[PDB]
């Protein structure tokens, strides 16, 4: 009967319904915006983990246009989200060898230098300035270029492609396709260059063959490079803005990081959990077999959808879940998702946020929201929450 999403999202607030559903009906039936049929909506942490983690659920199935989904275009079956084991498991195994947490930490110095440069630009502009335009938008795409060892001259081409891939793209041409192909040929050439001469970047590592051993196709590598750019961009850009919003609207929080800069990483985790970056449910999971959740048993062929932010506010798991606490002992949030499809960029997402917050705290202890709160322009049509603009003063 009821439609999902329940209501239009306001700011980063959570719909009061979810909290009711956790208590009264953890697994509810719901009608999604675009597929045919009803689906199950999972609202609690244990259930969410089961749907995400257990092999009895398939994302590949969700590619059927008849299958319910949050977004208008049926999913592309090539998308790594839509990959099912064991082909998906191979991709993850191989890319996971190169995308270590150790490789990400080693980027931190170059990433610090990158934020510093962006902020210097913002100081050149003078207070007050749009933190979106100067920090949130440019920073993630630069970070990903660093990760792919793109030379500085060619980064222009990556920005255009990321902006063109977003559904909100202003240009919205027939030409988008022209950009896509132009970009694709470039990536081809970049991977071929890596095959000819090994580089220390993540493309370089993926290009290497121990030659008695498992490695990716050149075409697989190109496609993976595009996958990493797109997944990492939209989420990161808005997530930066969202953490800053939380920090400044109750400024006691930002002051807490000024006082103790070592608190930043803990704070980032807490804000990842607290922020409903994904306004809607999850990419759909269709049951290959009967599976037993908390309160209901899902029959094979029934579609499930997870709301990550609700799970993150589950009262069983988190004391004062509705409150924002940078001094939690444990924080097992699924802001990055869970199981097979755990965002690969989970470490590079954390790096990006920790480095943006630390830089702000270090260069601007006097940082404050210049735009009035009521004035704030939140993005309206989107799967992902974020501010169109965020004017700040220092
Ligand atoms: C704040 C930053 C980020 C957040 C909150 C985030 C969140 C997520 C979530 C929740 C998923 C899982 C969705 C599902 O399973 O239904 C996911 C998947 C993914 N994320 Fe992210 N992400 C972030 C940044 C990035 C970055 C920086 C990269 C890459 C550089 C990235 C690449 C991916 C990829 C490739 C997947 C696909 C998972 C798979 O099937 O292997 N994301 N992300
Ligand atoms: C990599 C990201 C990932 O973080 C996912 C989980 C974000 C949200 C929850 C989605 O999964 C969203 C449902 C996507 O799968 C697609 C609708 C797509 C159009 O959006 C996306 O393409 C976004 C960018 C995904 O590909």
Residue numbers in the entry: 14 to 407
According to the publication:
The bacterial P450 OleP, from Streptomyces antibioticus, is an epoxidase involved in the tailoring steps of the biosynthetic pathway of the antibiotic oleandomycin. More specifically, OleP catalyzes a regio- and stereospecific reaction of epoxidation at the C8-C8a of the macrolactone ring. Among the known macrolide epoxygenases from actinomycetes, OleP presents a unique epoxidation chemistry since it targets a non-activated C-C bond, which is a reaction not easily achievable through conventional chemical synthesis protocols. In addition, discordant findings have been reported concerning the timing of OleP activity during the tailoring phase of oleandomycin biosynthesis, showing that OleP is either active on the aglycone intermediate, 8.8a-deoxyoleandolide (DEO), or on the monoglycosylated one, L-olivosyl-8.8a-deoxyoleandolide (L-O-DEO).
As for OleP-6DEBLS, the crystal of OleP–DEOLS (ionic strength, I = 0.2 M) contains nine monomers in the asymmetric unit arranged in six open conformers and three closed ones. Therefore, in the presence of the physiological aglycone intermediate DEO, OleP can assume two conformational states, an open one (unproductive binding) and a closed one (productive binding). In the open active site, DEO assumes different orientations and conformations, but none of the six molecules of DEO expose the C8-C8a bond, which is the target of the OleP epoxidation, to the heme iron. The residues of the open OleP interacting with DEO are located on the BC loop (M83, F84, L94), on the N-terminus of the I helix (I243, A244, G245, E247, T248), on β-hairpin β3 (V291, G294, S295, F296) and on β-hairpin β4 (L396, I397). The functional groups that decorate the DEO macrolactone ring alternatively contact residues of the abovementioned set, depending on the position, the orientation, and the conformation adopted by DEO in the active site of each open monomer. Electron density accounting for the sixth coordinate water ligand, typical of a low spin enzyme, was observed in four out of six total open monomers. It is placed at about 2–2.5 Å distance from the heme iron and the substrate ligand, forming hydrogen bonds with the backbone carbonyl of A244 on helix I and with the aglycon substrate, involving the C1-carbonyl or the C3-OH or the C5-OH groups, depending on the monomer. A further interesting aspect that emerges from the structural analysis of OleP–DEO is that even the physiological aglycone substrate does not induce the closure of the OleP active site in the full population of the enzyme, at least in the OleP–DEOLS crystal form. As a consequence, efficient binding of DEO that induces the structural changes required to close OleP and to shift the iron-spin equilibrium to the high state, preparing it for catalysis, occurs on a small fraction of enzyme molecules as supported by having only one-third of the protein copies in the asymmetric unit of the OleP–DEOLS crystal form in the closed conformation.
